[PDB]
Amino acid sequence: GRLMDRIRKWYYNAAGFNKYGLMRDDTLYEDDDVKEALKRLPEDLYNERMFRIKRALDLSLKHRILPKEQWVKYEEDKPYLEPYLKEVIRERLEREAWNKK
Amino acid sequence: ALLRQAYSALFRRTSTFALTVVLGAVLFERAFDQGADAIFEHLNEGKLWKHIKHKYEASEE
Amino acid sequence: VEHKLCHSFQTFNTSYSDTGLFGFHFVADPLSIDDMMFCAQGEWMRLCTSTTESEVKRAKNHLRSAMVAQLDGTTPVCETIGSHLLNYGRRISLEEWDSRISAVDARMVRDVCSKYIYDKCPALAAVGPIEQLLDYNRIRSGMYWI
Amino acid sequence: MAPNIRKSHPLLKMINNSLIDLPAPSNISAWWNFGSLLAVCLMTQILTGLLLAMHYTADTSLAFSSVAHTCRNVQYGWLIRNLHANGASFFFICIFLHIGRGLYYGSYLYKETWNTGVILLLTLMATAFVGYVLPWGQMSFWGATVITNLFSAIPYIGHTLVEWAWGGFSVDNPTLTRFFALHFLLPFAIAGITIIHLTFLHESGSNNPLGISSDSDKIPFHPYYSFKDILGLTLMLTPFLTLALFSPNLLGDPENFTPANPLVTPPHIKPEWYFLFAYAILRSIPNKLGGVLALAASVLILFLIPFLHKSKQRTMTFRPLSQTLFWLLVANLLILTWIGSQPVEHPFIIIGQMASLSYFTILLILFPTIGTLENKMLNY
Amino acid sequence: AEPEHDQRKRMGLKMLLISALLTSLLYYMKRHKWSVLKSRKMAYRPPK
Ligand code: HEM
Ligand code: HEM
Ligand SMILES: C/C=C(C)/C=C/C=C/[C@H](OC)[C@@H](C)[C@@H](OC)[C@@H](C)CCc1oc2c(O)c(OC)cc(OC)c2c(=O)c1C
Numbered sequence: 001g002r003l004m005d006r007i008r009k010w011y012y013n014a015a016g017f018n019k020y021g022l023m024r025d026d027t028l029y030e031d032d033d034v035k036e037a038l039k040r041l042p043e044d045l046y047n048e049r050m051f052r053i054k055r056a057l058d059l060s061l062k063h064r065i066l067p068k069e070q071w072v073k074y075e076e077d078k079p080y081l082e083p084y085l086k087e088v089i090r091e092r093l094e095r096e097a098w099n100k101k
Numbered sequence: 102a103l104l105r106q107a108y109s110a111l112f113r114r115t116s117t118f119a120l121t122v123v124l125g126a127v128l129f130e131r132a133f134d135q136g137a138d139a140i141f142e143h144l145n146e147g148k149l150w151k152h153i154k155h156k157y158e159a160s161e162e
Numbered sequence: 163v164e165h166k167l168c169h170s171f172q173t174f175n176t177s178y179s180d181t182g183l184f185g186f187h188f189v190a191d192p193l194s195i196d197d198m199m200f201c202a203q204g205e206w207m208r209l210c211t212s213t214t215e216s217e218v219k220r221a222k223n224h225l226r227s228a229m230v231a232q233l234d235g236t237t238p239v240c241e242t243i244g245s246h247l248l249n250y251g252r253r254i255s256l257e258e259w260d261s262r263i264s265a266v267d268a269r270m271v272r273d274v275c276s277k278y279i280y281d282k283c284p285a286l287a288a289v290g291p292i293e294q295l296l297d298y299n300r301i302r303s304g305m306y307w308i
Numbered sequence: 309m310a311p312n313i314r315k316s317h318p319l320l321k322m323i324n325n326s327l328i329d330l331p332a333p334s335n336i337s338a339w340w341n342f343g344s345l346l347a348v349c350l351m352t353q354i355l356t357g358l359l360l361a362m363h364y365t366a367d368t369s370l371a372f373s374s375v376a377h378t379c380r381n382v383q384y385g386w387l388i389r390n391l392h393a394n395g396a397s398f399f400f401i402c403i404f405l406h407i408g409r410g411l412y413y414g415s416y417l418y419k420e421t422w423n424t425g426v427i428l429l430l431t432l433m434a435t436a437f438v439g440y441v442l443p444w445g446q447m448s449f450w451g452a453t454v455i456t457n458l459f460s461a462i463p464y465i466g467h468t469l470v471e472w473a474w475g476g477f478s479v480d481n482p483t484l485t486r487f488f489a490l491h492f493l494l495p496f497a498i499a500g501i502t503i504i505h506l507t508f509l510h511e512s513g514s515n516n517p518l519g520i521s522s523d524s525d526k527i528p529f530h531p532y533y534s535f536k537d538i539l540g541l542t543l544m545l546t547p548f549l550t551l552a553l554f555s556p557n558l559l560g561d562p563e564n565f566t567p568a569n570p571l572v573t574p575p576h577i578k579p580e581w582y583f584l585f586a587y588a589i590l591r592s593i594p595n596k597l598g599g600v601l602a603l604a605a606s607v608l609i610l611f612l613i614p615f616l617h618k619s620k621q622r623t624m625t626f627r628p629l630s631q632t633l634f635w636l637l638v639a640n641l642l643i644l645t646w647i648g649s650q651p652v653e654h655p656f657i658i659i660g661q662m663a664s665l666s667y668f669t670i671l672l673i674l675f676p677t678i679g680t681l682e683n684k685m686l687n688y
Numbered sequence: 689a690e691p692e693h694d695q696r697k698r699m700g701l702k703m704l705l706i707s708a709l710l711t712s713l714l715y716y717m718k719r720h721k722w723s724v725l726k727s728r729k730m731a732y733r734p735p736k
Contacts, residue, residue, distance in 0.1 A: 011685035015626040020518070024686055029417075029622035030521055044734070051732040054524040060335035060517050062726055082688075113281060115307050137705065141698045149694075165311060197311050297528050299724050334725060379692075386692045387699075531721045539718045542711045549707070553700035 009074050018072035019065040020056040023049075025081040033092070037085040045080050166191075167198040179249065184278060185285070192291040199295055203304035210276035211308050215268050222263050229259055281306045326510065330529035333516035339413075340514070341540035342406035348541060349399035350502065354495050356392035360385075364442065366488035368481040371444035372567045387552075394552040396436055397559045398544065400582035403429060407610075412634055413623040415515040416614045420508040424501060426610045431498050433583070433607075438491040440580060444484060447561055449568030450577060452479050452487070461600035478570075519622030576651075584648030585641050591652065592661040602664065609671055616671065618679035620688045629678045637670045 012018070017027050026049060028034050041049070059065055111121040142149065171188030186206075190198050233239050233256065246253045286301060295301075310316035314324050363382050365374035379386040407429070409415065416422045441452040456473040460466050475482030516522045527533075551558060559581060563574050579587045589606045590599040624630040640663055647660040690696075719726075 008685055008687055011628075011682075014628045015686065017626045022520075024688075027518075027520060027621050027626060028688075029414075029519060029620065047734065048732070050524050053520055055730065055732075056518060056520070057333070057335050057516075057522060057525045058728065058730060062728075133702070133705075137702045138698070141701055165309070201311055297532070297724070299531055299721055300528055303531075386690070386696070527725065532725070535714070535718045535721050539711075539714045542707065542714060546707050546711065549703050550700070553696060553703055556696075 012074045012077075018074075018077070020059055021066045021070055021072055022052055022056050023072060023080065024077050025049075025079055026052055026056075028081065028085075033088050034081070034085060036088045037081050040084050040088070041081070049080065165194070165197060167194055167201065171198070171202065177249075183285070193294060195292060195295040199301070200304065203301070204308065206275070206279050207304075207306070207308040210272060210280045213268055213271045213275075218266060218268055218271055222266065225263060226260065229256060229263075279305070326506070326529075327534070328528065328530040330510075331513055331526040332529050332533050333514055333522035334525045334527050334532075335518065335522070336514060336516050336533075338540070339405065339409035341537060342402050342409060344537045345402045345540060345544050346399070346406055347502070348544075349395060349402055350495070350499060352395050353392065353399060354499070356388050356395060357492075357495060359388050360392055361488075361492060364488065366442070366485045368444060368484055371442060371484055375443045390552045390556040394548060394556065394559060396439065397582065398548045398551075399432065400436070402544065403432060404582075408638070411613065412631075413515055413517065413519065413625070414617060414619075417617065417622060418509065418512050418515065419614050421505060421512070422614060423611065424505040424508060426607075428498055428501050428505060429610070430607065431494060431501065435491060435494040435498065436580070436582070438487040438494070441484065441487050442491060443564065444568050445564035446566045446568055446572075446574050447564040447577070447580075449479065449570065450573050451579070452483060453573075456483075458600055458603075461597050480570075515622075517623060517625055519625060578649055581645070581649075585644040588644045588648040588660050589664045589667070591648070592657070592664045606667070609668070613671070616676045618676045618683075620683045620686070627679075627682055629682055630675070633670060633674055633678050637667070640666045640670060 012024075017024075030038070038046070038049075111117050142151065146152065168188040168190035171186060171190075173186050174183075176183045186202060188198055188202065233242060243253055282305060283302060284305065286298060288295065314320050314328070360375075360378065363374065363378035363385065365371060375389070379389050382388075407425070410422065410425070437451070437455055441448045456470055456479070459469045459473070462469060471477070473483065474480070475486055513522070513526070561578065561580070563576065566574075578584070586603050586606050590603040593599040593602040619627060619630065621627060624634055644660070644663045644667060647656055647663065650656045
């Protein structure tokens with residue numbers, strides 16, 4: 001049953017951040033981990049992410065969004081940080097538990 | 102052209118700008134207060150001591 | 163110099179047939195751009211407001227020299243002529259240029275700079291790590307009083 | 309050394325780093341003026357307040373008739389009074405929205421900036437409390453008698469803690485004086501704490517609608533947000549005056565136009581509007597202590613929100629679910645308030661007990677829950 | 689119960705009139721200044 005898929009795909013269109021042309025990961029709140037993840041990003045994937053934001057901001061200040069055409073499509077969202085992040089967390093968790101030993 | 106004539110003579114020199122506001126407010130005050138009181142008074146004809154006045158102010162005795 | 167403002171800065175009055183681009187260009191470390199600009203725009207303001215007789219006296223003498231140094235050799239002269247006829251109509255001799263310069267005095271500079279610099283919306287060009295210098299609005303505001 | 313004074317001067321350097329060259333997000337919305345407006349309220353209460361204190365006479369036998377006198381005899385005194393009074397309300401208005409914003413855009417992640425806020429809020433409430441008791445009207449009195457009594461709920465130190473409050477063994481003059489002295493002082497304490505609130509803030513810069521690094525496009529506080537504050541100034545300033553020039557006593561209970569009577573608690577006694585919601589919660593817990601406790605947490609819970617944040621994202625801008633919950637909560641208060649203004653009977657009583665159950669749950673349970681659920685739907 | 693009444697309202701009038709004008713005036717200025725940021729346009733041109 002595609003239920004789960006059909007749902008995520010929903011909530012995604014629901015959150016509608018993609019109307020600002022932002023990627024899922026683009027929205028993550030920048031905590032100590034993310035912060036580190038972001039520092040690991042290859043320079044291209046990074047300057048890119050930034051512009052995407054500096055554009056989102058420019059929008060949000062104008063009170064507008066992107067013409068439907070340029071909205072981000074669910075299946076095309078690139079989790080550019082998800083993996084980097086996870087690792088970061090992993091590393092930490094190992095350091096963390098290793099200091100309880 | 103007033104906007105030019107104005108900007109050129111008043112709003113340009115930050116020093117004259119002031120004199121304009123001052124001298125301006127001054128005029129603005131008078132005109133405003135006058136009409137204001139007027140708009141009000143009229144909207145209340147015959148109800149103010151300014152209207153009733155005469156019936157006792159140097160009328161009896 | 164005093165505050166290590168820029169690596170360099172330069173005045174310029176690029177002229178054209180019908181128009182022109184009077185301004186200035188400076189290059190500095192990402193972290194002083196502001197203070198720099200600030201002092202600069204100030205000078206402009208000071209120009210349109212308190213230029214002294216001693217200030218112009220020098221400029222004049224400085225200008226006269228470049229005036230001459232532009233005519234240092236063959237190519238240079240030829241250029242001047244090539245361009246004199248093409249833009250100014252005829253040929254403007256140094257004897258002439260010089261009169262026009264000994265003419266200029268304080269009052270004039272003030273009026274003239276004011277004429278073209280005071281409270282005018284300017285053109286800005288930024289390239290590099292410019293984070294520090296910001297808002298045209300603010301740059302604009304730096305065009306009067308200062 | 310330094311070129312432009314604005315940056316070197318020990319004092320200007322300050323005015324500067326917080327009113328002119330201060331880095332502001334390009335996209336902060338209306339809901340961001342409430343901080344400054346709150347300020348303006350503070351400035352307006354302290355001003356009008358000093359003025360009213362110049363004519364007040366803290367003393368049971370005269371406290372009432374002094375205010376009366378201050379309104380009738382003192383030039384423009386009435387206007388002063390009115391302004392001071394509605395100011396209060398407008399203060400609370402501004403503050404409730406200022407909190408709103410904070411909640412919906414998770415500004416509460418600026419913990420300290422936030423905690424101090426609570427403190428400020430709390431104080432304001434206290435401040436506004438004593439202020440009201442001053443006029444020594446029916447409400448003034450009885451409110452004084454209840455609010456303070458609340459502490460009688462604490463065991464041991466309790467019955468004593470009151471003693472101090474009143475300075476007597478019943479609410480009498482001694483109270484009125486120390487309350488005035490208190491009301492006089494407190495506002496200043498707020499002013500101080502605000503200075504801090506703003507400092508902790510300045511450590512992080514301001515938040516912003518989208519809830520993502522704004523470093524990629526900041527703008528000098530001036531002229532941008534400066535002009536924007538003045539507009540927001542006149543904007544609020546309007547209804548405030550309007551309200552205080554055409555219908556002063558609209559937001560104000562008239563039962564307070566009847567000098568306090570230590571012997572008769574008005575049959576229809578209902579708190580200043582800005583307290584109603586809490587009033588309600590306490591009124592739904594039929595138990596001295598519970599009632600008191602419910603109330604405590606009714607406000608103290610604010611301190612928790614920061615820990616009851618679970619969304620991988622910061623603001624609710626991209627969390628339709630949370631949003632819907634949020635507004636439900638707004639309205640949940642909007643309800644609780646109504647009830648406050650309604651007598652203790654049916655349906656009202658039960659409707660109340662629910663909204664209160666409602667309140668706490670949205671904050672303590674649904675929020676963190678709908679939040680988690682939310683990230684799994686985005687797949688994080 | 690409130691002698692002022694009249695003046696209270698007379699002011700109320702003036703207050704509304706100035707507030708109408710002033711609010712309006714500032715709206716312009718708030719926009720005027722912000723225009724810079726409203727009209728603004730940007731584009732990402734990485735190098736090749
Ligand atoms: C006398 C008390 C208060 C005043 C006058 C005040 C003032 C300010 C000011 C000036 C700002 C910056 C402008 C803005 O963001 O609105 C601010 C921000 C903030 N305040 Fe307050 N505040 C008060 C009360 C509170 C309260 C009670 C809370 C909630 C506990 C609070 C929470 C915050 C938060 C979270 C920020 C960060 C806003 C952001 O995300 O940009 N404040 N406050
Ligand atoms: C935090 C800001 C303040 C709040 C919240 C506030 C609120 C109040 C309130 C609600 C009243 C009752 C008014 C009424 O009858 O409706 C009041 C009265 C009074 N307040 Fe304040 N006040 C504040 C600051 C001040 C200041 C700065 C002073 C002086 C230090 C002051 C002096 C007075 C006096 C003398 C009265 C009695 C006259 C009257 O009842 O209006 N207040 N205040
Ligand atoms: C000297 C200073 C002292 C002792 C400190 C005071 C501390 C108290 C709090 O300040 C923070 C307090 C203002 C705040 O409680 C959280 C309010 C929301 C309480 C609201 C409140 O108001 C009432 C009120 O106004 C009344 O009058 C018309 C009558 C009332 O019932 C008969 C009440 C009432 O039942 C409640 C709960």
